């Protein structure tokens, strides 16, 4: 049906936007602290601490399978990256302080993206 095709054109354009948003967010992490999942081999207790791990690569996998239906969903995953990091790591560590910086810098990008999604439907 043509109704189905139209929803699919909208999902694809959402996805195109979200890829730009993801690359913008990932540029605020030049150190690449958040690029890949936490290694269970290198932090073996991690899953006792954090119930929903998240990282940029896992977001990108989901993005390329058009698995984000709206921006709320993508925002939820981004926030997990930040929030997991601020719980596991103490306040005086390089990791916590990188999350805080990514939150503040990403918060700008996501403030405009919310306007572009409303504005472009």
Residue 57's alpha-carbon distances to 10, 35, 97, 116, in angstroms, are: 23, 6, 21, 24
Q: What is the CA radius of gyration of the chain?
A: 16
Asked if residue 36 lies in contact with residue 43, where contact means CB atoms within 8 angstroms, the answer is no
| Resolution attained, angstroms | 2.4
Residue 69's alpha-carbon distances to 34, 56, 85, 106, in angstroms, are: 23, 17, 25, 20
Separation between Cα atoms, residue 99 and residue 117, nearest integer Å: 25
- The span from the first CA to the last CA of the chain, in angstroms, equals 21
The pair phi, psi for residue 95, each rounded to 5°, is -75, -45
* Experimental determination approach used: X-ray
Work out the angle at residue 26's Cα, subtended by the Cα atoms of residues 18 and 74, and round it to the nearest 5 degrees: 35
For the chain, list the domains and their CATH numbers. 1-121 (1.20.920.10)
């Amino acid at each position: 049906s043509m109704e189905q095709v139209a929803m699919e054109l909208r999902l694809t354009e959402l996805t195109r936007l979200l890829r730009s948003v993801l690359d913008q967010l990932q540029d605020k992490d030049p150190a690449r602290i958040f690029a890949q999942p936490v290694s269970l081999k290198e932090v073996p207790d991690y899953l006792d601490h954090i119930k929903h791990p998240m990282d940029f690569a896992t977001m990108r996998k989901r993005l390329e399978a058009q698995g984000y239906k709206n921006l709320h969903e993508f925002e939820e995953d981004f926030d997990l990256i930040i929030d997991n990091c601020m719980k596991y790591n103490a306040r005086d560590t390089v990791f916590y302080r990188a999350a805080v910086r990514l939150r503040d810098q990403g918060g700008v990008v996501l403030r405009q993206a919310r306007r572009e999604v409303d504005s472009i439907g």
